[PDB]
Amino acid sequence: LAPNDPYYQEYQWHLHNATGGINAPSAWDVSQGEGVVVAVLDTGILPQHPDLVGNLLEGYDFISDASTSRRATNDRVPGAQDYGDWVENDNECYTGSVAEDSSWHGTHVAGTVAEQTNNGVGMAGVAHKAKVLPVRVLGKCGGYLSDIADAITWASGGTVAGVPANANPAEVINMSLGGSGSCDGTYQDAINGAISRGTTVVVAAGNETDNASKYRPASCDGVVTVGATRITGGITYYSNYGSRVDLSGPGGGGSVDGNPGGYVWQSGSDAATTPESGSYSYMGMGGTSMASPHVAAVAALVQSALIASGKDPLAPAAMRTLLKETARPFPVSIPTATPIGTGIVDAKAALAEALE
Numbered sequence: 464l465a466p467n468d469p470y471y472q473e474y475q476w477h478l479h480n481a482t483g484g485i486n487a488p489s490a491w492d493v494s495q496g497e498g499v500v501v502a503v504l505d506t507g508i509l510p511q512h513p514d515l516v517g518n519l520l521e522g523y524d525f526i527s528d529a530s531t532s533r534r535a536t537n538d539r540v541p542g543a544q545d546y547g548d549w550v551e552n553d554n555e556c557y558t559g560s561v562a563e564d565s566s567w568h569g570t571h572v573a574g575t576v577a578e579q580t581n582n583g584v585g586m587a588g589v590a591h592k593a594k595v596l597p598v599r600v601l602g603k604c605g606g607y608l609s610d611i612a613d614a615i616t617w618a619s620g621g622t623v624a625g626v627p628a629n630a631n632p633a634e635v636i637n638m639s640l641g642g643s644g645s646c647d648g649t650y651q652d653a654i655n656g657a658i659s660r661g662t663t664v665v666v667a668a669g670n671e672t673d674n675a676s677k678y679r680p681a682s683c684d685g686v687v688t689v690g691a692t693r694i695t696g697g698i699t700y701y702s703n704y705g706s707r708v709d710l711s712g713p714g715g716g717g718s719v720d721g722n723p724g725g726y727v728w729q730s731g732s733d734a735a736t737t738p739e740s741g742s743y744s745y746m747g748m749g750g751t752s753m754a755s756p757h758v759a760a761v762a763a764l765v766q767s768a769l770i771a772s773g774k775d776p777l778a779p780a781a782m783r784t785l786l787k788e789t790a791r792p793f794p795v796s797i798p799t800a801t802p803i804g805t806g807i808v809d810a811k812a813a814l815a816e817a818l819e
């Protein structure tokens with residue numbers, strides 16, 4: 464499938480480039496992810512983005528701190544509206560931090576997963592007939608482990624005290640988020656719960672040019688840890704590495720690769736603070752954050768295709784095995800001391816092997 468989205472051909476190398484893309488055009492002849500739900504645990508979403516409307520569920524906001532959520536109370540509430548995670552001053556978050564505009568990171572990531580495709584608008588997405596379940600866990604200066612842990616539980620169909628039962632348990636969780644430290648019991652237990660319910664958990668390796676073993680949830684057991692490659696098919700300057708990294712997806716090499724080649728392109732906003740301070744747009748972002756949702760979406764394509772053939776969905780361990788075994792070996796040599804898994808996720812190869 465060559466979809467008709469106006470910016471797809473020029474911008475979205477990460478979908479269709481022969482060295483650095485995930486073989487999406489061929490995959491899309493087989494599956495678009497229909498009937499699957501991917502939970503995006505992130506900064507929230509702009510739910511009326513014209514290129515997302517139709518592929519989103521209401522979701523929920525798990526941030527239990529008014530200052531972080533920019534909401535009026537510390538309550539968790541239905542919906543996942545991103546209120547903006549901007550920070551006006553240097554050093555507000557940690558000693559050393561610098562002021563940043565609102566990321567709309569969750570809307571970008573959600574676009575990689577399920578941006579409306581072949582609709583003659585904006586950009587394409589990978590699992591563009593799936594639904595995204597947005598689960599807002601990050602706000603101003605980030606979020607809290609307890610919020611993220613309960614979000615994992617709820618997203619995967621587990622019970623959380625204080626939140627109504629999830630009517631849309633997700634086959635796949637994407638966490639384009641993390642921080643320093645080995646995986647603790649809190650993360651690991653929530654993740655083990657999701658896995659026990661059949662949910663595959665896909666996470667960003669991190670962007671510290673460091674061993675993924677030193678970060679969480681990257682270093683958690685049972686997860687798919689995703690490094691980042693360039694348009695060239697080689698390691699990005701920022702990607703974390705190590706034996707824990709399972710495979711890579713396109714994350715974008717940044718300025719060395721230019722515009723558009725250095726960035727992944729999806730739905731977002733130019734708003735600097737509140738949603739109202741800007742308008743809907745398409746944004747180019749780089750990171751393991753962008754790589755992870757390509758892999759989460761491919762998982763969704765696989766689960767969907769199987770259901771369509773009346774076959775059983777893959778258990779998490781099988782999904783991770785399939786993603787690794789079917790990845791495209793890197794077209795550029797990866798240095799021995801910075802491994803980033805078995806290859807670049809290959810949407811077509813994954814589908815072909817699952818349907819054999």
Ligand SMILES: *[B]([O])([O])[C]([C][C]([C])[C])[N]C(=O)[C]([C]C1=[C][C]=[C][C]=[C]1)[N]C(=O)C1=[C]N=[C][C]=N1
Binds near residue numbers: 568605669
């Ligand atoms: B990514 O953008 O590549 C990245 C991956 C992560 C595993 C290191 N995600 C983040 O940095 C997320 C989302 C984000 C929010 C705002 C600006 C840019 C990105 N954030 C976090 O995980 C986070 C944020 N603040 C504190 C701690 N962690």
Ligand SMILES: [Ca+2]
Binds near residue numbers: 514578
């Ligand atoms: Ca589109």
